[model samples]
Target: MDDIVPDVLDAVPAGTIKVIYGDDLEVKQGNELTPTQVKDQPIVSWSGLEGKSNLLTLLMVDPDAPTRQDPKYREILHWSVVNIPGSNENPSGGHSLADYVGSGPPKDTGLHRYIFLLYRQENKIEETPTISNTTRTGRLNFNARDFAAKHGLGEPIAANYYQAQYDDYVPIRNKTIVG
Candidate 1:
């Protein structure tokens, strides 16, 4: 969607990032899925690496927090994994800056777009405390552009997104977040 252009990034990447939830459920750009379908982290992978030594960073965020109509919390970070090897492209091999947390849009918030952005790293990121999934701190108002700029990560190499609205699974997921 055009929203991601100015909201989260200046311009969309020319390449596309692949996101698969569970097994077969793929995250096609701008597609819609239920919260129950994405209650767990999705398998994120990308292509187009310059070399074997290339490192990468991955980020997941929701620009439409509360509601698209009035997103006081414009951006809420969902996940952040860094130092992923380009050759492997598996997030498990990388250090997780923020633990993965599934979508849990608030009630009556309409559909929320969950975006996955991939960036090529010039070097390993500095150490930072991991943001646990159980806590809500360090998530709200996270600016992807600022994060990328601070880490010297240029524009995203790839990106993909899916929309999810309030559903029965939201409450169940919310209970697990203590802070």
Candidate 2:
């Protein structure tokens, strides 16, 4: 389990991020997560250190959107939030930067690594970096590292990543793209 959790040593002992699609599942570093199981918003849960009130930020990205070997939209920001009350209040209690968009690799694209990186915020973030489109399917080209540095988010408190391959591209095409 330790070896499978992404950046296991980098943050908070590689705390588990639960994704309840059917059977109790945790983010596995290289496991294949189908888009169907992850279509809905994932149940993201992590442990907080015993400390004073600390605001936290969460980021969901796909560094392998179009393809893992040749990713055109590397590190696409899927979701982001700030001002979450740290220390077990509610993992999702925060301001919404980008809405949650499930794994949606194009048809035939290789396994896409979806990374969830959490940051301990110093203060409640007032405004976030502008995202061209708040809609899930339209946003891309987001750099999690750079965004954190610019906002002074400091080092990540916890991080996890899972792999997902192409599933149903029809929904994505019907709603997002036009031919």
Q: How do all models score by TM-score?
A: 0.77, 0.68
Residue 127's C-alpha lDDT in candidate 1?
A: 45
lDDT against the true structure, each candidate: 0.66, 0.56
How does candidate 1 score on lDDT? 0.66
Model 1 CA deviation exceeding 4 Å by range = 1-10, 34-41, 47-51, 72-74, 136-139
lDDT of 1 by residue, 59-90 (tens): 66565666668777755445778888777755
Off by over 4 Å in 2: 1-16, 33-41, 47-51, 74-77, 87-90, 129-139, 170-179
Local accuracy of candidate 2 as per-residue lDDT tens digits, 82-135: 677777534566776754545355654655566666776767667555343234
